[PDB]
Amino acid sequence: ERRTFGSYKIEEITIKIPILDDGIFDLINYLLNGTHFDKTHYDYSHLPTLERDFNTASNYVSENYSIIVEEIDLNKSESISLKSPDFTVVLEYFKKVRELPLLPIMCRESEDSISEDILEGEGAVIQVLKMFMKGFLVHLGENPNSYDRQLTIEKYRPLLISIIGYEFTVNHIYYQLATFDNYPFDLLRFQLQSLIDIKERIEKDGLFKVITTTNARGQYQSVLLRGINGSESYLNLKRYRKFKVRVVGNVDNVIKNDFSSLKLDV
Amino acid sequence: ERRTFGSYKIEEITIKIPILDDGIFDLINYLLNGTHFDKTHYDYSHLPTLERDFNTASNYVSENYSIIVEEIDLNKSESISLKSPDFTVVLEYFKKVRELPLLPIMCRESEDSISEDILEGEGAVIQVLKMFMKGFLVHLGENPNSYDRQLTIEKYRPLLISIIGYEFTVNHIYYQLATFDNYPFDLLRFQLQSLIDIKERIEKDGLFKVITTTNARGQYQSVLLRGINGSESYLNLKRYRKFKVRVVGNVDNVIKNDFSSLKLDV
Amino acid sequence: ERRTFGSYKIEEITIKIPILDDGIFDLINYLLNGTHFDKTHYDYSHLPTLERDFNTASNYVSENYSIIVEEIDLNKSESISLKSPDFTVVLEYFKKVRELPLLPIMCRESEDSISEDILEGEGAVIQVLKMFMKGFLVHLGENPNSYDRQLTIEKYRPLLISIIGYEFTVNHIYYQLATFDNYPFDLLRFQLQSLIDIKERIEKDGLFKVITTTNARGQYQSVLLRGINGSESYLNLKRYRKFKVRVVGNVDNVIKNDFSSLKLDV
Amino acid sequence: ERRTFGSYKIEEITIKIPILDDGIFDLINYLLNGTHFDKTHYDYSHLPTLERDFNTASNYVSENYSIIVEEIDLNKSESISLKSPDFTVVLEYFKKVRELPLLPIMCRESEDSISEDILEGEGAVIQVLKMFMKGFLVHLGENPNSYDRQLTIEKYRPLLISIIGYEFTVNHIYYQLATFDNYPFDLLRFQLQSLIDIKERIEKDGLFKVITTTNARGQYQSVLLRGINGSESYLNLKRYRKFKVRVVGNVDNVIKNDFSSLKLDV
């Protein structure tokens, strides 16, 4: 059941709406386990240095996951969630509920205080995801679909966001990609080229804004990104699921029998 | 939207049951209109003399259809049905209901009284359908499916029946094919070869039996076929429908754009 | 209650979804009556020769509308609809239901048989709409909104289509604009520039495809456009309404009174 | 998200009723925290000595609030309420309920017994609110609305009441303003001028009346104000809420792109 890396799939439901398979839920679980590409469900010539970054980031995320795996109850569904711009994972577990800020880029006054091996671990993670998106887009271009006009990149926004955060804590393409979660596929297929213009001044003074609402029972902090149009968008939760894969098995038919051979009447 | 002749298609529905597209409902309508293969929704090298028989039978069925088209009301859905062994078509029409015995082979005491042109018309029809089935089976062998074990030939039984009727009013393959409407696909894919054995005696004395039930309000006549096992099966009605084809259009994508060309960061 | 020509407006509803006001329903009614710009609900320096084309097309559409106005019953809501690519209007009328193919460009084997005054009338209509869209887009750029990322050009597709039809029966911009009814606003605000590439070959052989489905009770004809990606889209109905304008009246306040004048205590 | 001080806002709801935003709920919370104007959600030239009184009163209210903050449970919505004429705040708190008489002016036989710093604190509070109302009214005059005829000052009555209490425990404008909670906006916009006449005799003998009803389970005390018409009104509870502010963010669009530049056909 192997597949190319960074893939997506399209499935139909009707009462003919399609839905997309991301390559993330499984990707998240793989990074949870530190699993290596060989023992994965996964033609990568144009993917330079893919494996070393892959497995280094897999291990780094593996121990980070273990950091909270240690506390987990035996007894204590799966509805993993992600938050921009510190790109934090969110879990739940019942008897029959935690988080981790994978890439905190909002404020880091430990540029040299944090050890360089940890920094390289995060850099490996962010580059891995960067190339993962590059693969996902190559995949989009490689095969077009009837349903290319029905959905948007919207899931992947925060990852691109994390990219630009590193950019400030070290671009035009990834930024403007992030700017439109609602952006459609074949559009990008058309105008990957001229995505060049804000020019310098709206990002020299912070890429994002931070606002807290004093809800009188707490302090709902929130991050408010600004996009190259010079505009803004609130960051929002996005609960995940993952489709229960079909039992279907490959036909792999070998008989390929001839029919003219049989002495049919005429 | 062209396709190969004699095709079938497989469609999924779930609350993952598949259903088959026959190539008959459309085929019936085409024979209704006498339409020629060029102006059809339809790689036929192994189909000898296909076109001349095709269009001759199309015309013959066209006038036969007109025989009852003349009487039809303007105002007076579509639920066409077929009956073995005279292979009769059945129509309905409402304001917002007839039949025709296309190939009556039960009793014909007009072997020379019926003109030879009419006889050639029916022979063209029966051969056309014969090759149509041969194509359908070549199609089955050409592409196998996950769902090859889920359905049977059951729709096409009466046509094979009509074949054997001509055989008596002029075989092993088509007979035994007809014998099992419940017969599965890939089985035939396996054992097309040895389908040879009843030997002479159960068919010298009539291929079928005829029984009428005196239901006290009418005489329900019925034909009871016997199969090479030396067994029997009652012939049954089979109401038809036809799926409302999807609006889907061919992507026919031409851009096939490169991606390494864009100056992505790394 | 005057407004600039070719305008749009944005209105909120919630149980904060916005909806757009087109400038079409009213525009359609104005062309129905042949009304001139002076006696309209409507800063047009950059609109060359606007009035002469405006009123000529208004008159032409007025008589064309009268062509079916003559037959209308006294007694016999309003749910006007439009169809590409002949860009036909659709009406209904009850006691307490027609159409007209305004710009038939699918097939016209009367290039010189049709008088030149009629041809100039249609050309005036199509240019009028062309500039109307140019104004609509200037309007989009002039004022951006919070909700610029929530809707698409989708209403106006067929008009752009009619444009390209004239192009064949005499471009890159209007074509690619039409190609994406789902296209978002501020995107166009960004990349109006580089919209240049199919190159010659997919449009030399017909801009559109025509397919009829033999639904066994009729012949549902349909037109299937192809877009610069080399892809396709089915053309679809779009029922219209028009919001019942609010009773609101301009405050136009004139008092602008001072307050420090009153002998407030401190 | 800064705004001018003492503001109000107008919001629409329909099944087009408007509602007003006060500048009080937030103001109450700010005085709860002793917050200073700089770190507030808030062009004040005509506001003399605003900041010193602002922050002094903020601190005074802050400790007064702390007086009951000390007792509050950790675990133990928000429905703050105010009562004239001692202008007392009212709170509630649940697991998942107190008051404070901010400006008791009904009876104070401690004119010199109460220290002068406390007295200056209350005087700062009352002047702060006095100017706050003056700003609110300047705001009303500065921008008029369609809905100026749909609501009344009714929320702010008790504050004006507290004013007149100080007047006795040290006017025509603030008194008559208080006299009509049901008074409409643009009226005041018209006749701020001649609000002069009861003349001396109905207020020399107490501004208000006090009546207790022996409800046989308690003593429901109540204060009964008298207005310059020589009439009366019972003082009433007014439960508060505060709208959950919209997530909306400022567009702050910067592109302001030209359109004639693109080589549109005509």
Residue numbers in the entry:
A (entry chain B), B (entry chain C), C (entry chain A), D (entry chain L): 5 to 19, 44 to 70, 74 to 107, 111 to 130, 155 to 228, 238 to 264, 269 to 337
Provide the publication's sentences verbatim:
The careful analysis of the recorded data clearly exposed doughnut-shaped (torus topology) pentamers of homodimers (10-mer D5 symmetry) and hexamers of homodimers (12-mer D6 symmetry), representing 80 to 85% and 15 to 20% of the particle populations, respectively. The global resolutions for each species were 4.7 Å (decamer) and 6.8 Å (dodecamer) based on the “gold standard” criterion (Fourier shell correlation [FSC] = 0.143), with local resolutions ranging from 2.5 to 4.5 Å (decamer) and from 5.5 to 9.5 Å (dodecamer). The doughnut-shaped P9-1 structures reveal dimensions of 12.5 nm × 12.5 nm × 8.5 nm and 14.0 nm × 14.0 nm × 8.5 nm in the decameric and dodecameric assemblies, respectively. The full-length dimers are settled in a parallel mode related by the respective 5-fold and 6-fold rotational symmetry axes holding their C-arm protrusions as staplers, as previously reported for the octameric arrangement of the RBSDV P9-1 crystal structure. In this way, the C-arm of subunit A interacts with the neighboring (−1) dimer, while the C-arm of subunit B interacts with the other-side (+1) dimer. The nascent portion of the C-arm is sandwiched between the β-sheet 3 (hairpin βF-βG + β-strand H) from one adjacent subunit and the loop βA-βB along with the helix αV from the other, while the distal portion is partially embedded on the surface of the latter nearly aligned to the helix αIV. According to the PISA server, 17 residues (~70% of the C-arm total extension) are part of the intermolecular contacts with the adjoining dimer, mostly stabilized by hydrophobic forces. Analysis of the final scattering curve with OLIGOMER revealed that P9-1 decamers and dodecamers were the predominant species in solution (fractions of 87% ± 1% and 13% ± 1%, respectively), with a small contribution by larger aggregates. Interestingly, as a result of the loop orientations, the pore is more occluded in the decamer than in the dodecamer (middle and right). The versatility of the P9-1 structure, allowing either five or six dimers to self-assemble, denotes the flexible nature of the P9-1 C-arm.
The P9-1 protein from MRCV (hereafter, P9-1) localizes in viroplasms of plant and insect hosts and, when expressed alone, self-interacts giving rise to cytoplasmic viroplasm-like structures (VLS). In addition, P9-1 binds single-stranded nucleic acids in a sequence-independent manner and has ATPase activity. Using an integrative structural approach, the C-arm was found to be dispensable for P9-1 dimer assembly but essential for the formation of pentamers and hexamers of dimers (decamers and dodecamers), which favored RNA binding. The multimeric structures of P9-1, resembling the ring-like shape of hexameric helicases, and its ATPase and RNA binding activities suggest that this protein participates in the equimolar copackaging of the viral genome.
